[PDB]
Every structure is written in C-alpha cells, then in structure tokens.
Amino acid sequence: KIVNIGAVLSTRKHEQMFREAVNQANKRHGSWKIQLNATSVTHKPNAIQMALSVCEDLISSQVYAILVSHPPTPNDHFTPTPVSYTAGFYRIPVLGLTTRMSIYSDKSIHLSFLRTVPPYSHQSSVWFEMMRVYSWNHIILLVSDDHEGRAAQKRLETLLEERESKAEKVLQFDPGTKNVTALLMEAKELEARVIILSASEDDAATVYRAAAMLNMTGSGYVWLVGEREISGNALRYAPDGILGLQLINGKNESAHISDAVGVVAQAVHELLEKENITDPPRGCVGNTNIWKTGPLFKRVLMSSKYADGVTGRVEFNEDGDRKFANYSIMNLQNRKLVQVGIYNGTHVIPNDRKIIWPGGETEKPRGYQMSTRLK
C-alpha cells in the first residue's frame, strides 16, 4: 500500500531537505509491503489563508501525520495554531518540532498535538535541582501574569511541597508594563537574597534596567533566569554573572526533521501490523465524521521508543512532550556567555571553570542574611 504523510515548513530548501530524509528512511527498513510519500506547503501572513491552505493540502493526500515549524517568528505564538484546529477536527495527529509555548500542552483544547522539545514549563526542574546541589533554601520568585508564566508557578510549588519547603514571596506583575520599581521595593526588605525570573524578552529588559537604580545587581545577590530571559533585546542590559541556561540543540530546525520521520516511520509499521485500519477521509469539504481510528494512532505513537536519535533519546510523557532533554548552563562574563556545566536528564555535572558571581567575588554567596532590626 501507499502511506502518505505531509508537513508544513518555512523554506523551500528545508522542504527538499525533508524529502531527502524520508527517502533514506524508506531505504532503511522499508520493503514491498508499504511505501511512503511526502507533501509540503509554506507559511502565509494571514492565518485564515493558512487554514484554508492547510486542507488544500489535505484534499490532495490521504494525510496520516503533519509537521509544523516557525523559523520566521513575527508571532511566535499564533504561527502553529491554525494547523492544530484544522487537523484536530479529524483527529489527525500533528507533530510540532519547534514551539515552546505552554498552552499547547493542555489537551482539552488541542485534542491531538505532540512535540520533540520540552516547553518552558519543564524548565523549573533544573532550577530546583541546582537548589539542592548548591544548598539554597530561601528564594524569591518573580513571574508574569500570562498563562506562559502562571504555568511555572504551579510547577515549582508541587516540586517543592514534596519536601515541605514553601518558597516565600511570589511576586506578580502585568506583562508589557513599565515602572516595576513599585514592586521591587516590596522585595527590598525581604530576607531571601536569590531571585528567580521568568518573563518575556520585552519585560526582562525593563526589570534589568529597573534594578539598576535599586542596587539589586550588587554584590551578595545572585540572579538566575530562563532561556528566553537572556536571548534578545534584554541581553545588552543584563548584569554580569546571571546563571542562565539554554537548550543543547534547539533552533536547529534540521536535526528535528530527521528525528521526527524516524519515530513516525516506526509507528506506522507497528500500527499497520493490526486489524481494521480504515484510512483518513478524503476532503476538507463533504465530510463531517472523524477518522474512526485516529485516537488509536496517537495511543500507539505515545510509547514509540527511538534509539539512533541525532538529538539523542526520544520519548514521550503522559501529556505528550519530549522527556529526558538536555540543558547547558551559562554564565555572563564580560558580556559573553560561557558554559559552566551540563544538565543531563536528572542530575547536573559542572566542571572545568570557576563560576563568576555578579558581585565579582569567587566564593559561593549564601542568602538569608538575618535582618537584625525588627518590626
């Protein structure tokens, strides 16, 4: 039989790069039983035009799976949503391989959606781990008000309540808001001396500037942030010594395609060795009934382990996301990011360099300076 899968990509060169990968995938373990195809489209400015073009792709092929990317990001959020609503109507399993928004994990809204990269919510796992290793026990949290930030608040709390630590003074602020010094002053008389930031590239620049007038960047105090906090217009204003972090091979946009076709190909062979495969419907128009075996496809696709992954081991969790991902810690010295360690799945192993704390010292500055003057 002929199994047809499609994808949506950015550049025509990448689309041809995609087709080359499926050819090598076919020659890897293929046979005379089932053969494969590929089909590709390109982005458009108006999302409504994309949605119509999405099932212009669908009428032309018995699509079994879709792929989506957003290498050009005038809107990093609204680019991969039109494909999800259109394909999710027929339970077509759509895979996304470069998108880090946390909204796409709520499966009640998006019925079928998978990933090959963990989102921003899973970032706080490394934050808590560094706390245990470095023995920091009094933290100040600082988060935005959008759903992108509120997810981090819940993630840290359940990870800390398992040991009954109860982090103190979680502060919120409206996104896109200037003059946050009315909020920082409330965090000026607090005992804890370590701040954890999680916001957007536009808000992070403001708080970095706002901290310059409060001596919040001075010695004794230690900052630690997320991936998006130090990649953008805010890096120029960032204070030195911020122990940020990054992804190992994110934004590659090329190794993911090789990984995505490998896991998909293993799934279609594993599934087709069964009964009652019925094929998807032909046509955006003229049909109203969902693919009768769509949920079955997503069910088997969840636990499909993959060994020879260019990015590494590929596996999925209960909600659907790449688990056991890699994280590479940074540190800002003389306006240049330098690696100071590696996070590998569960633990952290730093070596080969000495961490430069923001004040310029060379000894680990502990927090919790007991305020002698009481109220």
Partner 1 sequence: TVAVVFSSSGPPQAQFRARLTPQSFLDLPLEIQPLTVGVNTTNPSSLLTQICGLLGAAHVHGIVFEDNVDTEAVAQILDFISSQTHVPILSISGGSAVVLTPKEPGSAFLQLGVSLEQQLQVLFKVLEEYDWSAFAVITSLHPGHALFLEGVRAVADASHVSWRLLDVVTLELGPGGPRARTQRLLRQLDAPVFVAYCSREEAEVLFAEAAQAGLVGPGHVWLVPNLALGSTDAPPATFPVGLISVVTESWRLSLRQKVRDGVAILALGAHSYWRQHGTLPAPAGDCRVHPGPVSPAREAFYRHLLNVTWEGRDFSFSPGGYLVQPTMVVIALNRHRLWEMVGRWEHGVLYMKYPVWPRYSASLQPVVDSRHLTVATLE
Ligand X SMILES: *[C@@H]1O[C@H](CO)[C@@H](O[C@@H]2O[C@H](CO)[C@@H](O[C@@H]3O[C@H](CO)[C@@H](O)[C@H](O)[C@@H]3O)[C@H](O)[C@H]2NC(C)=O)[C@H](O)[C@H]1NC(C)=O
Strand-pairing partners, residue 332, are: 337
Q: Which is nearer to partner 1, 49 or 233 (CB)?
A: 49
Find the part of the chain contacting partner 1 (CB under 8 A) among 44-52, 178-186, 326-334, 344-352.
44-52
Q: Fill in the per-residue mask, 15 to 44: x = in contact with ligand X (CB under 6 A), - = not in contact.
A: ----------------------x-x-----
Q: Which is nearer to ligand X, 3 or 152 (CB)?
A: 3
Cα separation, 212 vs 205, in Å, equals 11
Q: Which is nearer to partner 1, 48 or 213 (CB)?
A: 48
- The helix, strand and coil proportions of the chain, stated in percent and rounded to the nearest 5, come to 35, 15, 50
Q: Report CA-CA distances (Å) from 354 to 271, 304, 309.
A: 51, 41, 32
Q: Which of 60, 287, 303, 371 binds partner 1 (CB under 8 A)?
A: 287
Work out whether 4 is an interface residue with ligand X (CB under 6 A).
yes
User: How distant is the alpha carbon of residue 258 from its chain centre?
Assistant: 19
Q: Which of residues 122-161 bind partner 1 (CB under 8 A)?
A: 146-147
Phi, psi of 220 (to 5 degrees): 85, -35
Q: For residues 317 and 323, is the Cβ–Cβ distance under 8 A?
A: yes
Work out whether 248 is an interface residue with ligand NAG (CB under 6 A).
yes
Counting DSSP H helices and E strands in the chain, the numbers are 9, 17
Give the sign of the dihedral formed by CA 224, CA 228, CA 231, CA 237: negative
Cα separation, 283 vs 274, in Å, equals 26
89 binds, among ligand X, partner 1, ligand NAG, none (CB under 5 to 8 A by kind): partner 1
Torsional class of 335: left (φ above 0), alpha (ψ -120 to 50), beta (otherwise): left
Closest chain position to ligand X (CB): 37
Find the part of the chain contacting ligand NAG (CB under 6 A) among 47-55, 79-87, 236-244, 248-256.
248-256
Find the part of the chain contacting partner 1 (CB under 8 A) among 21-29, 32-40, 77-85, 230-238.
77-85
Work out whether 47 is an interface residue with partner 1 (CB under 8 A).
yes
Find the part of the chain contacting partner 1 (CB under 8 A) among 179-187, 284-292, 309-317, 362-370.
284-292
- Among 44, 45, 102, 364, residue whose Cα is nearest residue 226: 102
Closest chain position to ligand NAG (CB): 182
Q: Which of 39, 53, 79, 86 binds partner 1 (CB under 8 A)?
A: 86
Cα separation, 6 vs 346, in Å, equals 35
Work out whether 11 is an interface residue with ligand NAG (CB under 6 A).
no
Q: Which of residues 89-128 bind partner 1 (CB under 8 A)?
A: 89, 103, 106-109, 111
Q: For residues 256 and 98, is the Cβ–Cβ distance under 8 A?
A: yes
Q: Which is nearer to ligand X, 19 or 193 (CB)?
A: 19
Q: Which of residues 315-354 bind partner 1 (CB under 8 A)?
A: none
CA neighbours closer than 13 Å in the CB half-sphere of residue 196? 24
Q: Which of 82, 93, 149, 341 binds partner 1 (CB under 8 A)?
A: 82
Which two structure tokens, joined as six digits, stand for 296?
């079955």
**Interface residues with ligand NAG (CB under 6 A)?**
179, 181-182, 214-215, 248, 252, 254-255, 310, 312, 326, 344-347, 349
**Interface residues with ligand X (CB under 6 A)?**
2, 4, 37, 39, 60
